[PDB]
Structure 1
């Protein structure tokens, strides 16, 4: 088959790709490097992270149904842990986990066939209690497998997006020193038992988009124009989320994230099941600031699950009008 190398782009952006397959089935070559480092989640909150390619989430890989994926996965000798990769996109051997367990100072090359259209989680799954821990330390990302024929809608007609953003949501369980401030550690394995106690409560301390509170606000703010049709790909590897575009809708929404299923239309809020990725297409009609949230508003605001979209274009007063500005009684 033809082979194609890919240069990965950190999220929320996506490496170049076609929607409808230009050619026939190819072998997609990706490479990633595992990086264990301490990341900042908030004003005063840090995480002993473990990443695919330095980012939470790991980067978006894009392919077409029928392609193959050949990934060189590498674990640099400065890392303290073994790691692997389970693609929910793949069939066999625990999604590839049973063939990619590599130690600090090793590499592995896995190939699988993308038989199934949709967005899918990939995450590290070293075995036993290492599974939850590596994932809640950030080791998860997404792979989107587009139908060859491009995206189809509910009645089977083509739909094309102008922009895909990859929203990687992730829940984290930072333990606290006695003083009620968040603990810091020199390495992950040092933080282990304290993180466990927090995990067993099933209450996350943080829940963030693209790695940290406010990561997709401020200079990280997502961008678009009125008339833009944007695909929002949203992953949650360990815990449910309920995405909502404040001031918008999901025009077409595959909440279970698999493109040969009919999308739902006109959604206020949709549902991403822990261990999955979903996709919502929206065409912006109104300019201005939007928020993209997890709509448990405690999770959106106290925990970190809020992104911003800045949209320019022409205001349409038909859709919305302030008839009487805030005047006194």
Structure 2
């Protein structure tokens, strides 16, 4: 796209504020931002807020979201689809033109770990170029295992293809498959989907802790066989809904756009890889690390 040549829009922080007991404002941008997806490989991604996947959104069950998208792309329209919400797609997930803003309102009444993404046609193009993310909706009454959890993090799986190449997006294997982490609390890492960051700067834990991960596989195209090396999931909640409670899973199957909450214990000091167990994808980037120490 001629109007994207040389464009590299600096990342913009997510803006969010509560405006009622059951009402939240969220303000995001659509923007064109260079991301290093593999060492030496820059992808001029289509993004929310200059991150790919986009920034984490966390709301409460029963919150109405008043969402504003500011489109900074000079030529391409963009939009937003939150899987958390009940909405009319043809009224509420509509395009925002270049240099314009749009505001849409809709409720999040289901707890869980949901994908969000651009909904502009062709949706494959927009998701593959980087316009994906996660929204977490916290359950009103928690999970039954809350009291057991010592530490939690967010992980997101996505793929990267040949740059802006619809033939590859439709017909080709992924070039890279990658994890990212998004911050839930101050000090947590906040990273983009790349092959290396979470190997060089592992997630941190302490020996004997129960860890919870909020996970989502945003695709665009692949399923994920999510596994943490050296442990067994004690508890799994499919899509993060507390009702969908599995126990003792070695590996969690996630569809494209599929989420879960998973919990496991790290018993011994060391580095624990986190993978999709489709090992072709792992080899192409999808290995993160959890370093577990005595302190």
The verdict on a shared fold, with TM-score over 0.5 as the criterion, is: yes
**1:220-259 equivalences in 2 (<5 Å):** 221-237=202-218, 238=220, 239-254=222-237, 256-259=238-241
**1:2-13 equivalences in 2 (<5 Å):** 8=14
| Contact 2:30 2:46 (8 Å CA) reproduced | yes
132, 135, 145: which one aligns with 2:137: 145
97, 100, 123: which one aligns with 1:106: 100
255, 274, 281: which one aligns with 1:292: 274
Supply the distance in 2 between the matched residues of 1:207 and 1:307 (Cα, whole angstroms).
11
| Contact 2:93 2:119 (8 Å CA) reproduced | no
Q: CA deviation at 1:60?
A: 1.6
DSSP-derived class of the 2:28 partner: strand
Supply the distance in 2 between the matched residues of 1:69 and 1:276 (Cα, whole angstroms).
21
DSSP-derived class of the 1:224 partner: strand
DSSP-derived class of the 1:134 partner: helix
Supply the distance in 2 between the matched residues of 1:79 and 1:227 (Cα, whole angstroms).
51
Supply the distance in 1 between the matched residues of 2:150 and 2:24 (Cα, whole angstroms).
23
Cα distance per residue 1:194-232 (max 9 Å; x no partner): x1221232411111112111121113x111112333221
Tell me the equivalent position of 1:198. Answer: 168
| CA distance 1:163–1:112, shift in 2 (3 Å) | farther
| CA distance 1:93–1:172, shift in 2 (3 Å) | same
| Contact 1:234 1:272 (8 Å CA) reproduced | no
**1:265-280 equivalences in 2 (<5 Å):** 265-280=247-262
DSSP-derived class of the 1:120 partner: strand
Tell me the equivalent position of 1:183. Answer: none
DSSP-derived class of the 2:124 partner: helix
CA RMSD in angstroms, aligned pairs only: 2.5
Supply the distance in 2 between the matched residues of 1:101 and 1:163 (Cα, whole angstroms).
38
Tell me the equivalent position of 1:58. Answer: 54
Q: CA deviation at 1:162?
A: 3.4
Cα distance per residue 1:73-102 (max 9 Å; x no partner): 2112x54311000011111222x8744411
TM-score (ref. length: structure 2)? 0.83
Unmatched 5+ stretches in structure 2 = 1-12, 181-192
Tell me the equivalent position of 1:119. Answer: 113
Whichever of the two has the greater Rg, that structure is 1
Supply the distance in 1 between the matched residues of 2:119 and 2:111 (Cα, whole angstroms).
23
TM-score (ref. length: structure 1)? 0.75
DSSP-derived class of the 1:216 partner: helix
85, 93, 116: which one aligns with 2:80: 85
Are positions 1:166 and 2:154 aligned together?
Answer: yes
Supply the distance in 2 between the matched residues of 1:36 and 1:285 (Cα, whole angstroms).
43
Tell me the equivalent position of 2:263. Answer: 281
Supply the distance in 1 between the matched residues of 2:177 and 2:197 (Cα, whole angstroms).
12
Tell me the equivalent position of 1:305. Answer: 286
DSSP-derived class of the 1:271 partner: strand
| Contact 1:119 1:258 (8 Å CA) reproduced | yes
| CA distance 1:159–1:271, shift in 2 (3 Å) | farther
